[PDB]
Symmetry: D2
Subunit: 335 residues, 4 copies
């Protein structure tokens, strides 16, 4: 039958990965783990502020919940090493808690009996960081623990690859205007990780913040390692984000048209192209990992010296989740 | 010299109580306790999203911080029983963590050496619940643990008293349209206390939620115990709230004017009166505990049967804080 | 073939009425009028911040736009008396500009050649005010200008009817906690109609405001004329709203359960029932005119005197639009 | 006595300039013009969602309003050529309506009798564009119509000057993450100027949009004419903005520290310097034209090739307004 998936952390990425799996044959979520009870899990699956009402039926049953007639087993175990993955025969854990973002920590799922772990974030340790349709083919099926990178990395990789392949990337700087996330406080309050900015009221501020997306791009595209860096501004939309990239290229006399054309030629189910004057809410729930926006391309030329600026939208939620689940499927399929 | 105050929980209420104590002679905050470091505390005192920049100078120093030339000792101790209150000679603890909202739990501060505790919230146990300028005179100086009630209770009490004194309260229902607070999640997520509504994205929803304010009004005004109940709708403003009360009265043929008049006559530093067409942002940072809005008075008469509706604004932060600090001062002065 | 509909004012209600007519056979929108060009119209139809991407294809063509292979003629004419309705054989104008909310003013469409007008708001003059599934049967086919009421009226009517039929309505008061609309300013600015509250930053305040919904309920349910009144708080969500109604009933010893069952028994495609602890975003895009929320029903009893409170959600946009289009269909079919 | 000022367009910039003039001696606002009545004007002066309650007393009087005992005459006249500026002896009109942003159009105030006009925006035609403390010394007193530039320009100019003087500006690109403003729609609607992005729900989207600030910088700093370009993202905060500038410099091996120090050395009352990890609400109401944020400086070095990124905050309202008022004072003082 299907690939057996357990989701660890039924949060934003967890539940959306659950929804998305509902429309990909060969994958079944058989178990979910988190820190709450079934009443709350079922409820947050059914209702979603940004992504909309869940389409199927959800019902609390014994030991978990039923979704469109399928039993999902649920657990409330903060220590992953104690999860009953061996008895459940879990083929892949989707690790979406935010607390196991390291090869050695995530290993706990393997000890508990899962065959492989896919982490919904950048992760430290000796493992591959994968953006689907940019470098998934670097997976060979011997990996046990894999990172699915970040929303920002997924928005940036296909854009950066085209810039480098077609024009030769000398260097660039990124800013991501990014929806606020669960890691920010509702009101000004002490922040768990001592970040004085993620401390502030999330929905009432433009908030500068760091991201590894550009700095660690070299893990996704080794041939440009060290050539990008940048940061983020977290702003008050609840999901939907934009990556602006300003670069220096080797090729001279570059034009808006050549850049846009090159992006369009690279488009697929991960990397979308648009020429419509859209805004963030238009990309909520979209399944492209990156939507290239040709209306935002600019070229500064002073004499023979040029800066090239481009921008790609991503739903930091659904865009990333759709990539995560593509990498999931590919990863499972290799065994 | 001054009354020695320690603040437990340097959060929204804690920091604002600190600010407000800066302009009230005879009160000095000598200690603060929370779960973070000085860098974070100093920072959140200096900067405040809704309430504005702190006016004085704040500098991180050894074992705490200096504010306008005064040393504040700071601690990072979750178990209150362990705080050095005896060494510091604490006269009153302002208990503003949200975790000691009960007479027996709050007792921990007394064991630790504080003479008295004032809790920035409704609290269970055998103790007095005080709304300044409605029933603060019920304090005699033999109390060790006192509750300052809630924001909503302070908004409501003075309105409820006038209605009862002047018209005879038969019964009523309340809804507070309330700013969202720190116990709501930033994004849809499991809620610590299992509340499926406080679980939702705070700044993106109208959220029905409970409040004891009306049900427990009888602790502040015994003679109307059991006559009020109601709830809240948490909405996306970061601070600033409104209490609507709909009531049945014993007196007949009541008019809008008679109600407004009676409210105006009862106005003081705690209970304000306005006839201007204001909106929530207008009351941010105000120091009335309750601002009666005459433009919102409504009287429904069918034959000889009437419903009377009124509304009072409050800054759930600063209004409550100003009331809290008035009570603190009165409380400390009684010994 | 189909009934020929022209939409006047391609705004929030106009474009959603357009979307909604795409899925109701026997109605075709053949013309649209507004104050802009086709580029803008096509665009606002394609992309909708709260209601999501339009599903079909939209293309600017000559003299209007093409939707799913169908030609829509578009005009840019502020004076309705000059629209080419006679030439286009318009059966019904859906009047959604906010500028023709009066029988005599709306008469301009009839002079221009439309057979009938349906107004997407309360309207003054000698005409029927219709809430589908509460009093649409009051239409006999001799009306030329009809009002579809307001979102609030549509949320309230079916609730008020069950209350009266099953308990005897004595009197009541309403508050609707309501998403902000286009008649509010983005920033504090002079307000076109002199309302000092609708003048304020819409997305940054809780804003009291008037509404005729309750006061004029007797146009929809004559037997309770004069027994309801109340107002609105406009709050920062971009669509989705809640009506709170506090009532006195002739029936004594009423329980929460009795009220809830009576509501459930009246449910249909206009009046939904829920027991889930939902929040405003959960109703965005729903097609019930009114969603009764059983979780919010309260009964305050003091001796034999009771106040009953209930609450019904409505997407002020899509709920109202769904009702408007049901009324449109029924209206057109009577001829 | 004082310089006589009239404010045309008592909008955000108009009212804030009015407040700010209350604390600059030698300036008196004697008259205000807009399109509303006195009730509305007085009210919007008193109450301000982001900027707070006005401190003095405001009272509607005959033919205007009284502020702190001073009579302000008010008018309701859309055609500036008809304003009674000669009878009032206006020395300067502050042109803040957004409808006279051109030398020839603004001439109308001169014909009506004003001696000089200062425009609260970029303006076309033969006139000087002034950022106070960057180029106000280019004013000689023979100017009759002057532009105060934009908030963005005022944020950018001092930053760009330091970059050019100390390192040699080769070229650069700018993005401003900007609070939404009054020219955006509350809900998705046709936009007055045909802009399909400014058409969208302002407080629910990240919205790319154009700005002349970088492109026209050469009007403020001639020696870098043509070297900058860029755009804006309008995001959901009601006021408070950030300018990010990414540049190529002549000087090689530039460091973060060198850049920051050079910015600190240039600081004055128009150009602030900070090393605190602040967020947008922290700059609401600040009087710096530009607040340089040292924590956001980055230097990307690949071999011998560098990009330098910096960022400066501004309250697009109060920062701009304080700059406008300083230019007003200097302008009037030259005659
Ligand atoms: N845009 C995004 O939200 C986004 C995009 C890509 C990746 N990510 C990453 O994915 C991860 C999750 O992000 P999120 O936004 O979904 O966070 P979230 O807070 O919504 O989800 C975390 C969930 O996991 C649960 N959890 C926490 N500790 C646990 C434990 N020890 N055992 C079991 N369950 C536990 C929490 O209760 C919560 O339900 C993070 O690493 C985040 O950085 C987020
Ligand atoms: N926010 C309001 O509108 C408001 C109004 C009236 C009353 N209150 C009440 O005041 C209390 C706190 O309110 P708040 O909004 O400031 O909460 P908050 O979210 O700001 O948190 C308060 C602080 O308590 C600290 N804390 C938590 N546990 C602690 C511990 N064990 N020891 C020491 N410090 C600890 C937290 O780190 C935080 O800084 C609550 O009881 C609340 O209901 C709040
Ligand atoms: N939006 C809601 O929540 C809601 C709910 C129920 C009823 N309504 C009512 O429907 C009507 C429209 O509401 P909306 O919120 O969709 O407004 P809106 O501002 O989005 O739409 C009005 C549209 O009509 C256009 N218009 C204005 N004058 C015109 C004219 N003279 N000729 C042609 N076009 C013109 C405007 O350009 C705009 O597109 C109002 O009466 C409103 O009260 C609104
Ligand atoms: N909002 C900002 O951050 C900001 C910053 C710098 C400059 N500006 C510029 O300042 C100008 C005004 O901006 P705003 O945001 O205060 O706009 P606003 O809409 O808030 O105020 C404009 C005012 O002009 C009045 N008005 C319009 N036409 C008029 C007429 N011809 N005669 C008399 N009064 C008229 C309106 O009633 C309104 O009060 C614009 O040119 C704008 O670009 C805005
Ligand atoms: Cl995150």
């Amino acid at each position: 039958m299907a690939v057996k998936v357990a989701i660890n952390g039924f949060g934003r990425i967890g539940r959306l990965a659950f929804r998305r799996i509902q429309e990909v044959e060969g994958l079944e979520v058989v178990a979910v783990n988190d820190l709450t009870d079934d009443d709350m899990l079922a409820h947050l699956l059914k209702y979603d502020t940004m992504q909309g009402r869940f389409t199927g039926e959800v019902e609390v049953v014994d030991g978990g919940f039923r979704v469109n007639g399928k039993e999902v087993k649920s657990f409330s175990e903060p220590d992953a090493s104690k999860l009953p993955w061996k008895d459940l025969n879990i083929d892949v854990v989707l690790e979406c808690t935010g607390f196991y973002t390291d090869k050695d920590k995530a290993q706990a799922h393997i000890e508990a009996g899962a065959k492989k772990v896919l982490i919904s974030a950048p992760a430290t340790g000796d493992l591959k960081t994968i953006v689907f349709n940019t470098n998934h083919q670097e997976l060979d099926g011997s990996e046990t623990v894999v990172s699915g990178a970040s929303g920002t990395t997924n928005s940036l990789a296909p854009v950066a690859k085209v810039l480098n392949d077609d024009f030769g990337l000398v260097e660039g700087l990124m800013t991501t205007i990014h929806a606020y996330t669960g890691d920010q406080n509702t009101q000004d309050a002490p922040h768990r990780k001592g970040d004085k900015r993620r401390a502030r009221a999330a929905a009432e501020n433009i908030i500068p913040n760091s991201t590894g997306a550009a700095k660690a791009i070299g893990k996704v595209i080794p041939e440009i390692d060290g050539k990008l860096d940048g940061g983020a501004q977290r702003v008050p939309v609840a999901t939907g984000s934009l990556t602006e990239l300003t670069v220096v290229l080797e090729k001279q006399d570059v034009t808006v048209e050549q850049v846009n054309e090159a992006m369009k030629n690279a488009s697929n189910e991960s990397f979308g192209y648009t020429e419509d004057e859209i805004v963030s809410s238009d990309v909520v729930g979209m399944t492209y990992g990156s939507l290239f926006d040709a209306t935002q391309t600019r070229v500064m030329s002073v004499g023979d010296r040029q800066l090239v600026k481009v921008a790609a939208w991503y739903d930091n939620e659904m865009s990333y989740t759709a990539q995560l689940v593509r990498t999931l499927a590919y990863l499972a399929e290799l065994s």
